[PDB]
Amino acid sequence: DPDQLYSTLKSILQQVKSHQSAWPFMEPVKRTEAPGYYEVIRFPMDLKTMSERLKNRYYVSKKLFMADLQRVFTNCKEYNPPESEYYKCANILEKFFFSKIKEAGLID
Numbered sequence: 001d002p003d004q005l006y007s008t009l010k011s012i013l014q015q016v017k018s019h020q021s022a023w024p025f026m027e028p029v030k031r032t033e034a035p036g037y038y039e040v041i042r043f044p045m046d047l048k049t050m051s052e053r054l055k056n057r058y059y060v061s062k063k064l065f066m067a068d069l070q071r072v073f074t075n076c077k078e079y080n081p082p083e084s085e086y087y088k089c090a091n092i093l094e095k096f097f098f099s100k101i102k103e104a105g106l107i108d
């Protein structure tokens with residue numbers, strides 16, 4: 001029951017990471033790569049951090065997992081212009097993400 005959710009989330013998270021539009025979100029944004037990012041974005045999130053949280057048994061509900069992944073997308077859309085490559089990847093990956101949640105039948 002805790003293990004089933006874990007399996008499902010791990011599978012979903014791994015598929016998101018393997019996706020060709022995930023590259024911007026793989027790791028914490030680097031300061032050398034992004035002007036005053038950490039002054040603008042107060043709740044940073046990335047897929048590496050999500051993998052640890054998953055490993056650390058943080059994701060006890062669907063809701064917590066969704067909030068973190070959704071935050072990856074909303075941070076990107078707050079920081080970046082709408083026709084930036086980064087914004088485009090976020091929306092592509094978000095579509096993919098929601099497809100995978102629905103395929104898994106995942107609910108709270």
Ligand SMILES: Cn1c(=O)ccc2ccccc21
Pocket residue numbers: 024025029030033034075076079080086
């Ligand atoms: C996700 N993201 C941003 O949202 C903004 C800058 C940036 C730079 C390098 C890598 C990822 C980045």
